[PDB]
């Protein structure tokens, strides 16, 4: 809706001021309501202007010209708003043609550890603000966990693969700046069982609904019943699902017991009736003989003998009446018995096949969080749900590496440079690194500040790859320990021809066991060339890194042969298997909210370190060691856009500190 949509696209509420804005505009937010709406319009309009053409720099002068009265009345307010948006990277981020060339004199010096998207994004901003910036990268390439495989015409992504909706995504801006061949991924995803045949539509929908009901139940368990500690240990999502599943199995058995208990009660009531009818039949039989003996006394007869015949006649019809009423009651209970024998409750909660298909949905959850469900925090695993972007998910058909390569343009990047030690003091920092090709070649970089974008996996290493001097404080290291760093791998299969449905972008494979539910569980058809990409998720991810490529490719072919037939599936021309946990510069795939952790730990990862004073009694020094990366952004963890946004955040915090605010 014009300006309101610009707010949405920048992850801002159009109709109110954020916490970050309140800090920079305390006069406005504590002031009258009318002035707030002017601020909000100026903000929303400036964002719209930037978003309509993000290929060129939006200057303050250009912004003020395109505003109308009474909003362009106050010029300092427009200047303050524009400067805020530029500093925090809401406008003039990414790759754009600069109107005013960069000032030759550079102010301050920053070392950025790592040239992934978080590092690259921060670097561009800091250079754009007029700082001297150098990136130290251990790999022989930029991009980090954005890692694209390229051989001939084959282009597949072993790391980041998918833009998860453009609605609110800063990668929407980057896609207008860089040629990413964005291609919508169609949602249709047929599951194929272990044998190779499709799951029937009736069963597929039944299990998926039950999976979501099970998930909903774990959330109910967490928030309503407060089932979050068990044996002084935090409850995982895996535990909770196990407990929920067990309670459904309990109910199935309780339901059977109550049904069969109703049958015995009916059968005992019938037994009591039949005994009464057998005793009555015997009383009728005896009474019939007495009537027959009395009746065979031929007339003429006295009145007592006549009475005897008629007395016994009356008594016999009275007993024959009772037996007829009891035979009606026999008929009522016999049909009431037959209805309960006809309509029993369920035999099982879930069969072997249902439970297998249910494990696929669990594996899909283990892919999403890059970890076994036994590691996920029950309460907080889905804490970032509210900030999900709207729209279709998209493939990057150019290969996602096109983004970091473009972001690296015009930046001082030292490749093959492994940081070994980070020293930070009140007077400055020095970063000590080596050449990865020959470890004896040592380098020393001196700077005013360090931005650490090392992956959480690297920060977790024991014994450490990177030493901090002085050591990081307990509040930082405990957060590092608490946070999860998952694993997820990809098998790329390049063929000479398409043997699969070209209109279906993805299809599942259901594993035989729970143990192997993540193993090659999901296939992707995303690229122009004939490429299939299979995922190894869950517990399989870690285990499958110790198995060779030939065996892994064999297991993929085995599965694909089962689905499309042996003659249809040729041997692939090129193959690649990722091993992200064994990668020493990643040590895993991406972060997750582990049991015992929360969203607050992401905020702790983001908090910069301030060293002690050099001389005792010297004034409180400024912060020196800053942190960015997917593991540092609470609302967008484990993503490219999260990394991107975290870099923009730290460039602003660093610029505010060393260039001064506004």
């Amino acid at each position: 809706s014009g300006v309101e949509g610009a707010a949405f696209q920048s992850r801002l509420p159009h109709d109110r001021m954020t916490s970050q804005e309140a800090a920079c505009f305390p006069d406005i937010i504590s002031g009258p309501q009318q002035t707030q709406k002017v601020f909000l319009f100026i903000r929303n309009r400036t964002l719209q202007l930037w978003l309509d053409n993000p290929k060129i720099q939006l200057t303050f002068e250009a912004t003020l010209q395109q505003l109308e009265a009474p909003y362009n009345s106050d010029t300092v307010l427009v200047h303050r708003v524009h400067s805020y948006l530029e500093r925090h990277g809401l406008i003039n981020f990414g790759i754009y043609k600069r109107i005013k060339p960069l000032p030759t004199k550079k102010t301050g010096k920053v070392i950025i550890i790592g040239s992934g998207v978080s590092g690259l994004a921060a670097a561009r901003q800091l250079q754009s603000f007029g700082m001297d910036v150098t990136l130290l990268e251990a790999r022989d390439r930029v991009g980090g966990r954005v890692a694209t495989f390229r051989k001939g015409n084959y282009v597949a992504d072993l790391g980041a693969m998918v833009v998860t909706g453009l609605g609110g995504n800063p990668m929407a801006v980057v896609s207008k700046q860089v040629n990413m061949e964005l291609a919508k991924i169609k949602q249709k995803c047929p599951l194929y069982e272990a044998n190779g045949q499709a799951v029937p539509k009736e069963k597929d929908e039944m299990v998926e609904q039950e999976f979501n009901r099970l998930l909903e139940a774990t959330s109910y368990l967490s928030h309503q019943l407060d089932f979050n500690v068990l044996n002084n240990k935090p409850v995982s999502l895996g535990q909770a699902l196990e407990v929920v599943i067990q309670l459904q199995e309990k109910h199935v058995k309780d339901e059977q017991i109550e049904h069969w208990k109703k049958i015995v009660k009916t059968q005992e009531e019938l037994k009591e009736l039949l005994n009464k009818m057998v005793n009555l039949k015997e009383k009728i039989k005896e009474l019939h003989q007495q009537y027959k003996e009395a009746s065979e006394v031929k007339p003429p007869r006295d009145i007592t003998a006549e009475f005897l015949v008629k007395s016994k006649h009356r008594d016999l019809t009275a007993l024959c009446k009772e037996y007829d009423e009891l035979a009606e009651t026999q008929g009522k209970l016999e049909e009431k018995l037959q209805e309960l024998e006809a309509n029993p409750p369920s035999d099982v909660y879930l069969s072997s096949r249902d439970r297998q298909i249910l494990d696929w949905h669990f594996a899909n959850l283990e892919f999403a969080n890059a970890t076994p469900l036994s590691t996920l925090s029950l309460k907080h695993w889905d804490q970032d749900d509210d900030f999900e972007f709207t729209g279709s998910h998209l493939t990057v058909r150019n290969g996602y590496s096109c983004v970091p390569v473009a972001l690296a343009e015009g930046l001082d990047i030292k490749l093959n440079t492994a940081v070994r030690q980070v020293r930070y003091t009140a007077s400055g920092c020095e970063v000590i690194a080596v050449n990865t090709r020959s470890t004896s070649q040592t380098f020393i970089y001196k700077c005013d500040a360090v931005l650490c974008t090392l992956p959480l996996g690297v920060l977790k290493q024991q014994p450490p790859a990177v030493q901090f001097v002085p050591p990081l404080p307990e509040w930082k290291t405990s957060a590092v320990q608490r946070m999860g760093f998952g694993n997820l791998n990809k098998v790329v299969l390049c063929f000479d021809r398409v043997f699969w449905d070209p209109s279906v972008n993805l299809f599942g494979h259901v594993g035989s066991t729970t143990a192997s539910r993540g193993e090659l569980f999901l296939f992707w058809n995303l690229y122009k060339a004939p490429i299939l990409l299979a995922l190894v998720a869950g517990e399989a991810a870690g285990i499958m890194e110790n198995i060779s490529d030939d065996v892994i490719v064999g297991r993929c072919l085995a599965i694909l042969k089962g689905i499309f037939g042996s003659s249809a599936v040729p041997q692939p021309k090129e193959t690649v298997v990722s091993r992200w946990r064994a990668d020493p510069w990643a040590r895993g795939s991406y972060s997750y909210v582990a049991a015992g952790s929360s969203g607050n730990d992401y905020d702790l990862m983001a908090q910069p370190i301030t060293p002690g004073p050099s001389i005792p009694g010297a004034p409180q020094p400024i912060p020196r060691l800053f942190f960015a990366g997917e593991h540092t952004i609470r609302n967008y963890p484990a993503t490219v856009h999260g990394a991107l946004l975290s870099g923009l955040r730290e460039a602003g915090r660093i610029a505010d500190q060393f260039l001064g605010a506004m």
Partner: peptide
């Protein structure tokens, strides 16, 4: 996390 899911997006427990 959950936001990563492209195929068969889980709905249970989301608002």
């Amino acid at each position: 996390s959950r936001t990563m899911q492209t195929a068969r997006k889980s709905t249970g427990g989301k608002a």
